[PDB]
Amino acid sequence: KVFGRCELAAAMKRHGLDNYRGYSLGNWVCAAKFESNFNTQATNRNTDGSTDYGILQINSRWWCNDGRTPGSRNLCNIPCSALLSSDITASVNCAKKIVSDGNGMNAWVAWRNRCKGTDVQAWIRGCRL
Ligand SMILES: [Cl-]
Ligand SMILES: [Cl-]
Ligand SMILES: [Cl-]
Ligand SMILES: [Cl-]
Ligand SMILES: [Cl-]
Ligand code: NA
């Protein structure tokens, strides 16, 4: 599923991401835009052989099991395919674990390089939230 900007903002808010660990909702929407272009089915292969999955491009090296990343962990205790669903619940729950682990949203390269330090509230401007 390809979300609209405000549709995704409202879904993320219902799932508890607004100000989760101090990150306002615009941060999450900006990260989703640049990681996946709001597409829950996005996948991208990394040079080390791991793969990133879903709307927040969660990586199989640490966070989910895809059966083809030898020596990886599965800290969200989910198959990576669960992260491609039109229902973002699995992605959100896993992201909450990721952002809690110490590095905050710096875990998302696109967030660091394209959202951090910008006016992220613009990403939820106009939405009925
Ligand atoms: Cl915001
Ligand atoms: Cl772009
Ligand atoms: Cl594996
Ligand atoms: Cl933080
Ligand atoms: Cl940009
Ligand atoms: Na894994």
From Swiss-Prot:
* GO biological process terms on file: cell wall macromolecule catabolic process; defense response to bacterium; defense response to Gram-negative bacterium; defense response to Gram-positive bacterium; killing of cells of another organism
The record's tissue-specificity note reads: In the egg white and polymorphonuclear leukocytes.
State the UniProt keywords alphabetically. Answer: Allergen, Antimicrobial, Bacteriolytic enzyme, Disulfide bond, Glycosidase, Hydrolase, Secreted, Signal
Cysteines engaged in disulfide bonds, as pairs: C6-C127, C30-C115, C64-C80, C76-C94
Which residues constitute the catalytic centre? E35, D52
Locations listed in the record: Secreted
Oligomer status and interactors? Monomer.
What this protein is called in its record is: Lysozyme C
* Source organism: Gallus gallus (Chicken)
